[PDB]
Symmetry: C3
Subunit: 198 residues, 3 copies
C-alpha cells in the first residue's frame, strides 16, 4: 500500500484543501465527504473555498464517485467512476502513444486508461543521464499528472489551461521523482551563472 | 479521530496549517506554542506576507481566544478572550430559528451551543428521499465560521467574513462522516453538465 | 527533534507543504525527493501555477541548497549551493550588533551561525518584566528568513524578501515554546478556567 503518490486539489487557479498521501495502491478521489484523509479516499466534497462560485459549485456536484487511481506492476491506471467524463494530461502517457506533450486525454464514464509506465520513464531517464542537467531537470514535469473533472481543456475546448477548469488535481509520483533524484544529484552546474542583484 | 479540524484566515487569505483536534477541549488562542499535536491551536506564531497593521492590531486582542468544547454529541463555544467573538452556525441558527446566515456575537466570558448532533442527524433523516440536491446542501451544516474581535454580515455592514482580519473555519468530522454514509446514496441526474460550457 | 519547521515561497506566494525537521541535520535543496518525512526538504518537485521564467531560472541554481544544522543550542547555516544565499536573523543581528533588518550573505561553501537560543533565553529573561508588548516582540526572533541566489534589503535593489523568487521562513520551535510559557504567564487577558466544561 506504499505511498506511490500524493495528490493536490485545485479550483481554477487556487489550491483548495490539504494534500493527500496515498497509503495503498488503490486510492479513490471523489466529491463526497469523509474527513479521513489517512487512507483509501480523498474526498473533495467537504473542502471549502472562499473564492468558490456557482459554476465551480455546479461542477463539484458532478464529481461523484470521481476517479480511481490504481498502481500495480509498475504502472498506474485511471478509471472514471463518476457519471461525468474526466480529462487527463500525462506526458509519460502522451509519449507512449506518440501524442503531443500537452495532449489532454478524455476518459469517459466507466472507462479506463493507463496513464504511466515506470520502465518506460526509467528508460527515458537513462537515455539522458549524460545529455544535460537542463534536459534531465525537465523530466520532473514527467512525474506529475493533471486531470480535471467534467470540464475539458485544450484543443476542441474553449478552456486552454488546467487553471481554467473548475475542479482539478495534480498527482506527484514519488517513485519516479525519487529515481530522478538519484540522478539529478550529479549536477555541479556553474552554467549560465546569473545575478544576485538584478 | 479528531472531532474536528480548523483552519485560520486573515481576510481572504488562509494563514498557517490546518489544526486537527486530538481532544474534546480545544483552545484556539493568539499565543505561540508551535506544537499542533494536542490541546491548543496557537495563532500568534503564524506569519502572513500580506498582513497589515489593522490585522496585526486585531491579532493582539485575540488573547485566550475561543474554547471549543465537544461533549455528549454537542459542541460549545466559550469566549475566553477579552474581546468578543462572532459565530456563524447554520445548525445553531436552525435551532434558534434565526436566518441561515445569522452571525451570533459571543461576548467575553459568555457561552453558546453552536452544534446539536441530534438535530443534524434528524435533518439528515428527513433529507433522504427528498433528493440529492438538498442532501448535498447539508454539507454547509457541517462547517462553522467564527471571527475574533470584529463581526461581519448583518448588524454591521452585510459584509462577508472575508472582510474580517482574523477568522477561522471549523469542520465537524462526526457530521461530515455520517453525511458521507448518506451521500453515497448516489444521484444528481440534472442536465448532465456540459464539458465545454 | 522537531527543532524547527520550514515554509517555501516564490515571491509573494507560499508554495508546497510545510516541512518539519525530524533530525538535527536538514538539507533544503532544489532536487526532487518526495519524502518529506526525514532529512531533506526538496524544492525542485514543487509546483506553482504563478511561476514565471525568472523564478524558474533561480530554482535551477538552488542545487544542494542550504544545510541547516542544529547542535549545542546553536543553529548553523551552510551554503552548499553554487550560488550564494542570504539570511535575515534578528538573534544573529543582535549578537553581531547589526541592524535588526540586516541581511547576511552566506557565500557558496561558507558557514554562519544563525541562532543561539542561550542568548535568546537571556533576552527573554531581560524582558520578563518590561511589558507584554516587548515580550510579544521576541516572537520575531523566533523566525528566520533566507532566499536563494537573490540578495535583498539594503546592499541590494530588492528591499522586500517577497521580491525575491526563492525564499523560505524558518520557525524555531524551542524558542517559540519558551516564549509561550512567558507570554501566557504574563497573559494580557484573564479568565482562569472554563465555565462550560
Amino acid at each position: 500500500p506504499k505511498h506511490w503518490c500524493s495528490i493536490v486539489y485545485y479550483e481554477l487557479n487556487n489550491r483548495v484543501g490539504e494534500a493527500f498521501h496515498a497509503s495503498s495502491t488503490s486510492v479513490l478521489v471523489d466529491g463526497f465527504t469523509d474527513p479521513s484523509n489517512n487512507k483509501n479516499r480523498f474526498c473533495l466534497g467537504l473542502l471549502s473555498n472562499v473564492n468558490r462560485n456557482s459554476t465551480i459549485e455546479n461542477t463539484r456536484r458532478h464529481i461523484g464517485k470521481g476517479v480511481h487511481l490504481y498502481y500495480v506492476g509498475g504502472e498506474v491506471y485511471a478509471e472514471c467512476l463518476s457519471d461525468s467524463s474526466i480529462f487527463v494530461q500525462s506526458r509519460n502517457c502522451n509519449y507512449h502513444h506518440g501524442f503531443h506533450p500537452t495532449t489532454v486525454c478524455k476518459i469517459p464514464s466507466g472507462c479506463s486508461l493507463k496513464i504511466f509506465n515506470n520502465q518506460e520513464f526509467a528508460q527515458l531517464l537513462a537515455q539522458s543521464v549524460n545529455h544535460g542537467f537542463e534536459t534531465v531537470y525537465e523530466l520532473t514535469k514527467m512525474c506529475t499528472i493533471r486531470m480535471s473533472f467534467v470540464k475539458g481543456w485544450g484543443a476542441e475546448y474553449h478552456r486552454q489551461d488546467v487553471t481554467s477548469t473548475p475542479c482539478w488535481i495534480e498527482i506527484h509520483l514519488h517513485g519516479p521523482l525519487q529515481w530522478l533524484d538519484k540522478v539529478l544529484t550529479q549536477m555541479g552546474s556553474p552554467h549560465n551563472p546569473i545575478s544576485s542583484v538584478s
